[PDB]
Amino acid sequence: VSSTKNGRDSESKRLGAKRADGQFVTGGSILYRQRGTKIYPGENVGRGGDDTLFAKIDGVVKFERKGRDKKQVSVYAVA
Amino acid sequence: FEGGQLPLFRRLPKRGFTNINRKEYAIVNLDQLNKFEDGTEVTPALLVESGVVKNEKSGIKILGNGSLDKKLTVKAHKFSASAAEAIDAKGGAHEV
Amino acid sequence: PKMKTHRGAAKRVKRTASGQLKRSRAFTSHLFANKSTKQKRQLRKARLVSKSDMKRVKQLLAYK
RNA sequence: UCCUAAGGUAGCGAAAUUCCUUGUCGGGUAAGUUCCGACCCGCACGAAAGGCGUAACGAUUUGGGCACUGUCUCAACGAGAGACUCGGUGAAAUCAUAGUACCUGUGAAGAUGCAGGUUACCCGCGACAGGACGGAAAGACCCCGUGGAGCUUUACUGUAGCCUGAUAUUGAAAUUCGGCACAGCUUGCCCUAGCUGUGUUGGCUUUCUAACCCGCACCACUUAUCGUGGUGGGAGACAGUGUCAGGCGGGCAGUUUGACUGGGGCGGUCGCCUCCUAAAAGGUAACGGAGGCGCUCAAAGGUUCCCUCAGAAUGGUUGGAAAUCAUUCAUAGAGUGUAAAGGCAUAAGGGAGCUUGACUGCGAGACCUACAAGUCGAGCAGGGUCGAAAGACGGACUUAGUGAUCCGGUGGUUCCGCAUG
RNA sequence: UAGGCCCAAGCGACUGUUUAUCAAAAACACAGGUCUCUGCUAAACCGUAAGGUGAUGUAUAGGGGCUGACGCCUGCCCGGU
RNA sequence: GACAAUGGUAGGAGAGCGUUCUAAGGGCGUUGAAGCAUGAUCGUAAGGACAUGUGGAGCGCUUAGAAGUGAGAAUGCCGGUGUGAGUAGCGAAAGACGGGUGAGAAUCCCGUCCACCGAUUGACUAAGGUUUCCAGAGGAAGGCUCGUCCGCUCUGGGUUAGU
RNA sequence: UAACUUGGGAGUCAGAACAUGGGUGAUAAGGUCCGUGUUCGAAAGGGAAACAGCCCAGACCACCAGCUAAGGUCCCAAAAU
RNA sequence: GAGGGUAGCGGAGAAAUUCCAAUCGAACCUGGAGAUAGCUGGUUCUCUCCGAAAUAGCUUUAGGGCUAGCCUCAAGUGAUGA
RNA sequence: UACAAGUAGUCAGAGCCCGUUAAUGGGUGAUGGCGUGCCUUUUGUAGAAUGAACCGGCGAGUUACGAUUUGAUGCAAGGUUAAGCAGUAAAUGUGGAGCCGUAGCGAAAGCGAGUCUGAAUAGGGCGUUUAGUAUUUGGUCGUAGACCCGAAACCAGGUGAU
RNA sequence: ACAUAGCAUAUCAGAAGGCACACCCGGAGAACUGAAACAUCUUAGUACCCGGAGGAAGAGAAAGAAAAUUCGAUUCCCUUA
Ligand SMILES: [Mg+2]
Ligand SMILES: [Mg+2]
Ligand SMILES: [Mg+2]
Ligand SMILES: [Mg+2]
Ligand SMILES: [Mg+2]
Ligand SMILES: [Mg+2]
Ligand SMILES: [Mg+2]
Ligand SMILES: [Mg+2]
Ligand SMILES: [Mg+2]
Ligand SMILES: [Mg+2]
Ligand SMILES: [Mg+2]
Ligand SMILES: [Mg+2]
Ligand SMILES: [Mg+2]
Ligand SMILES: [Mg+2]
Ligand SMILES: [Mg+2]
Ligand SMILES: [Mg+2]
Ligand SMILES: [Mg+2]
Ligand SMILES: [Mg+2]
Ligand SMILES: [Mg+2]
Ligand SMILES: [Mg+2]
Ligand SMILES: [Mg+2]
Ligand SMILES: [Mg+2]
Ligand SMILES: [Mg+2]
Ligand SMILES: [Mg+2]
Ligand SMILES: [Mg+2]
Ligand SMILES: [Mg+2]
Ligand SMILES: [Mg+2]
Ligand SMILES: [Mg+2]
Ligand SMILES: [Mg+2]
Ligand SMILES: [Mg+2]
Ligand SMILES: [Mg+2]
Ligand SMILES: [Mg+2]
Ligand SMILES: [Mg+2]
Ligand SMILES: [Mg+2]
Ligand SMILES: [Mg+2]
Ligand SMILES: [Mg+2]
Ligand SMILES: [Mg+2]
Ligand SMILES: [Mg+2]
Ligand SMILES: [Mg+2]
Ligand SMILES: [Mg+2]
Ligand SMILES: [Mg+2]
Ligand SMILES: [Mg+2]
Ligand SMILES: [Mg+2]
Ligand SMILES: [Mg+2]
Ligand SMILES: [Mg+2]
Ligand SMILES: [Mg+2]
Ligand SMILES: [Mg+2]
Ligand SMILES: [Mg+2]
Ligand SMILES: [Mg+2]
Ligand SMILES: [Mg+2]
Ligand SMILES: [Mg+2]
Ligand SMILES: [Mg+2]
Ligand SMILES: [Mg+2]
Ligand SMILES: [Mg+2]
Ligand SMILES: [Mg+2]
Ligand SMILES: [Mg+2]
Ligand SMILES: [Mg+2]
Ligand SMILES: [Mg+2]
Ligand SMILES: [Mg+2]
Ligand SMILES: [Mg+2]
Ligand SMILES: [Mg+2]
Ligand SMILES: [Mg+2]
Ligand SMILES: [Mg+2]
Ligand SMILES: [Mg+2]
Ligand SMILES: [Mg+2]
């Protein structure tokens, strides 16, 4: 009589920022989980096979403008 | 029991076997040997009587934890390389 | 009477120096074509029984 | 003409069967959803789970008459038992304590007991039953419990029993037909189609009598239709019985037969991926709104080098609105294996050369997280591919494409090996 | 003290039988029909067996299934089980 | 001295009250123990004293130990007693009067009349019961009232077979 | 003025209304499903006639003392006819 | 009517789940036995301090359970909390 | 106490009657304010949801053996005995077999303050760089009916056809 | 037929039956239950029934245990665990 063909959804993936601008992070810490490059890897930051941005060195996170429309995240060593 | 969720000790697998001929040795370290007077002939019987070793298990093995400060003649079923070296270096002797 | 050891758990764990329980890993039986090289390599490595599981199961292995 | 094993005959039919339906028509009545007669578009009759009739019969069901009447119009009176009063005797269910009003409201949404009003001097007796969601019975309907029981079956697993073969009890003989091997001949070292013997190996069939059997006769024990023994007859290595085996086996047994759910059933759904709902971190429900997955690729992977689209306008043959060619414009409207989203024109898109990193040991640190798992990861070592080199490479633009343990198979192994090898 | 009667229709032929204690009926039974098994230590049935019922019977008999007096009848399909 | 905290269901934590028994110490008691009853008593609570009456022989207190250690509810179990209530009921029917008896009479006995059954409410008798039968005595209980009476109570009797 | 770690003991897994951001339903429900806050739950006291969930406000005990909150001050009924 | 026979995994049934000693879809008694009950009911003195949850995940799971979350007690750390 | 609307009390309070564990007393209560029992179960019960007529007695986390944790105590790189024997059914003596600890790591051979993985003197897992042990109070768990009462049923052997 | 059934007589402190709801040995042998369902498995060789005892029964003087300097019937307790 009546039924819905809907009622499906996948598990949420907990994307987004994992560390704050200005925060100290150790090498390897994930900085940003994403699909595609919504944010680009900056200095001392790598981009894993699934587009995750992670720090390569110990240091301070900094989210920065990349040109006019894009942005990146970098990690800088503390003095 | 986990209310019907497959319990931990069924979702995990079994590992290994037990050796029928497994040997385990009563262990004595050099720091424990330090209680016998220099020149002593330390033997399994002496270790048991002195109370250093209670259960002899498959035999006495000498191990190298601590420092030996005495010259001894040590008779045991087994020696660690380090234990034998320390016993010899303190002027003593060892024999299996 | 004496409490009885859980024999399956005893076949699946070993007690470490600090009293923890070393365990092997699930997903290591078959269907290896469906798990990545990295997955299988790391599933090769043993773990410990979690604290939350230990609360539940510790009496089963009191003699272990 | 399609299909079937074959397409319902006679009789009967709005029926103990007709939903629609009070079918329609006729009869009966002043008026008839019932009844009788007829009709036949039989939702969904029909020939031994018998069809259609049928005298007699029926505490059977049904409709109509006459008679009859307190059934009724519409009630009245009278007799007796109880009720009532007095003497005697004297229970019961029920019961948190009770000085136990009504109305409108309030409230677990229907109040003696709460609010605000209204009404009401204290205590009996005969009566009535509106309420005390009155008493009586831990609702029998409904659902639920990994409850019970009886029942069914082409649910599962069994089993009494039956059938069938081997073998033991179990012996004698003859004929006849095969498998294997040797040898001889034999027709197109050995093949093919055959033949006669030679050796065990075995089938089928008969015959015999001595095992075994006779709820057959006679004889004795013995006054006995039991039993035992004897004799004759019948039967006979069969049957019966033991062990083993295959088949059949709701006859009988033990059980299973999911959950969610705007009650349950029925329908739908159940794991994984993407989006919206989701309230600009993350997370976030409904049987809310939309779609995908259970793969694919030997290149559609790695690396080096090179390249840039879709569309439009204008010319041009077969050629048209779109095929292929040319110029210009064209910033992404193309493409990115496959849903969506996020990305990608410094390409992640397109082409080519060479290649196999779609490596081995790992792994600081981190995300996610109840657990088990899931995800990312620099960097180190080994040995490589492409590149002049820097360097890139532990699959694919990213996120689905999957399943624990137990058990078993296969390969490898400087592990173990129940006195020792 | 001692039948009410009559006209019709459905069902069951009939006399019987039944839910002791909410159902007496159109249900069961029935005489009749038919199918089927059974050659006698019968088949069927009870029992582990012995021993029994069947039957001190023998196919005009015995068990089981279905139908249900009587009258007129009982069509087609053997692909499936 | 100051000033801070102290609502609370599931539930966690703490400190305590009281019951029976045991050990040791120290006490009380026929000049009256426990129990019970009453009182205007004391402590923050569980609870502890005291006085008086009843009672008539056992019992506190201190420290420690040990538990059948605390009830208001289980349609709880057993007992007692209420309520309903002087209420329902007193189980098919015809009695009336006279005379007795008696502490007492609708109810026992006797009489007369009346009424009921009479294919029977009569007469036998098999089962079944087992003394209920008879005589004298009784009136607690039983008898649905009463009771002088009884299938009840007491006492003593009673059943005879060759057919 | 908490927080975290380790260890002993738990209970809980039926939630309600109200306000507000939304789905669903009908911009229906004392409806239903999520987000956020409060209260009830487990909270007495004052107000809202009465009125778990609204408003004020969190009861250690005593007082025949004072000031206030919400809400109120003609009489019931404390306080302004 | 009398005397007898058939007995519960069974009898008996002109068939109703019908009877087998006043309730028969399997009599009655005793035993296994305190079957099992993820259900309902009940669970006894006092004060003091703290004080929840009605959620997630998985579950032949949905009024049950497990781990997490939230309470409590203790020890530790030491400003790491608001 | 006969003009009154009652979960029956509570707080306020005249009148009347008394006189005590002598305390800023006892009994009664005209009249005023406030006020819908208790338990259970619930989101929420005055609930018209459940239970109890009343009173009394009786009526529900226990014990054994194991585990774990905490407190206590003795001894401490040690700690401790079991059965048995002796003893008064005792304390206790004796009994060192055994158990736990003093060393871990590995599936194992084995090596050992290290070991496993690994080709690796790399990296990583578990360890080392003191404290245990015996008895016992408390808490909790396991095996036992395991806090108490309650099925419908299942099985076994008997008893019944008055 | 021989004598074998059979039959008759005599002897026997021969047997029988009971129970202590215990213990022992043996025959035969459940189910509720646990497995959060259920069949293997468990309950359990338990309950019940039956036979046989004895004061105890059963077992017992190695076709044993082992792996050294071997031990030397059986039974029972501790431990191994
Ligand atoms: Mg998503
Ligand atoms: Mg990738
Ligand atoms: Mg493998
Ligand atoms: Mg008609
Ligand atoms: Mg028909
Ligand atoms: Mg037919
Ligand atoms: Mg017929
Ligand atoms: Mg008749
Ligand atoms: Mg009268
Ligand atoms: Mg009277
Ligand atoms: Mg009540
Ligand atoms: Mg209302
Ligand atoms: Mg009122
Ligand atoms: Mg009622
Ligand atoms: Mg009920
Ligand atoms: Mg069945
Ligand atoms: Mg069963
Ligand atoms: Mg369901
Ligand atoms: Mg609804
Ligand atoms: Mg937000
Ligand atoms: Mg968000
Ligand atoms: Mg691609
Ligand atoms: Mg060998
Ligand atoms: Mg008839
Ligand atoms: Mg009847
Ligand atoms: Mg009748
Ligand atoms: Mg018929
Ligand atoms: Mg036919
Ligand atoms: Mg408090
Ligand atoms: Mg307070
Ligand atoms: Mg506590
Ligand atoms: Mg008690
Ligand atoms: Mg009266
Ligand atoms: Mg009355
Ligand atoms: Mg009356
Ligand atoms: Mg009367
Ligand atoms: Mg009478
Ligand atoms: Mg007499
Ligand atoms: Mg009388
Ligand atoms: Mg609601
Ligand atoms: Mg609701
Ligand atoms: Mg909300
Ligand atoms: Mg309040
Ligand atoms: Mg008020
Ligand atoms: Mg003021
Ligand atoms: Mg005023
Ligand atoms: Mg009958
Ligand atoms: Mg029926
Ligand atoms: Mg009966
Ligand atoms: Mg049992
Ligand atoms: Mg029980
Ligand atoms: Mg508090
Ligand atoms: Mg499952
Ligand atoms: Mg007055
Ligand atoms: Mg609650
Ligand atoms: Mg409710
Ligand atoms: Mg009421
Ligand atoms: Mg109830
Ligand atoms: Mg009641
Ligand atoms: Mg009581
Ligand atoms: Mg317990
Ligand atoms: Mg009879
Ligand atoms: Mg089970
Ligand atoms: Mg179960
Ligand atoms: Mg013997």
> How many other CB atoms sit within 10 Å of the CB of residue A4?
5
Instruction: Determine which helix (DSSP H) or strand (DSSP E) holds C64, and give its type and residue range.
Output: none
User: Smallest Cα–Cα separation from A63: which of A13, A5, A20, A4?
Assistant: A20
Domains belonging to chain B, first-starting first, are 26-94 (3.100.10.10)
Cβ distance B2 to C56 less than 8 Å, yes or no, reads yes
How many domains, chain A?
1
Cross-chain Cβ contact B9/C29 below 8 Å: no
What is the spatial distance between Cα A2 and Cα B35, in angstroms, rounded to a whole number?
Answer: 89
Distance of CA C36 to the CA centre of its chain: 22
Sheet holding A40-41, edge to edge: A24-25, A59-66, A70-76, A40-41
Q: Which nucleotides of I are covered by protein (CB under 7 A)?
A: 65-68, 77-79, 98-114, 125-128, 141-143
Strand I close to B67 by CB, under 7 A:
no
**C53-CA/F70-C1' distance, Å:** 42
* Residue A10 within any structural domain of the chain: no
CA angle B49, B53, B59 (to 5 degrees): 110
Q: Which tokens sit at B76? A: 């045991």
Integer Cα distance of B70 and B35 in angstroms: 9
Q: Which nt is closest to the CA of C58, judged by C1'?
A: I68
- Rounded to whole angstroms, how far apart are CA atoms B92 and B72? 5
B48: three-class secondary structure by DSSP: helix
DSSP per-residue string spanning C3-52 = PPP-HHHHHHEEE-TTS-EEE--SS-SS-GGGS-HHHHHHHTS-EE--HH
What are the structure tokens assigned to C20, written together?
């923890």
Neighbour tally for A72: CB within 10 Å = 19
Round to whole Å and give the CA distance between B25 and B78: 9
Note down the domain range covering A52: 15-79
Q: Which of B2, B10, B15 sits opposite C24 (nearest CB)?
A: B15
Token couple for A63: 């989210």
| Structure determined via | cryo-EM
Domain for residue A61, yes or no? Answer: yes
| Rounded CA separation B25/B77 (Å) | 9
Answer yes or no: are the C-beta atoms of A53 and A35 closer than 8 Å. no
Q: Where are the domains of chain C?
A: 1-60
Rounded Cα distance between A34 and A53, Å, is 8
Resolution of this entry, Å: 2.0
Which residue in the block uniquely carries the two structure tokens 């009477």? Answer: C1
CA→C1' distance for C4 and I65 (Å): 12
Task: Map tokens 């497994």 to a residue.
Answer: B22
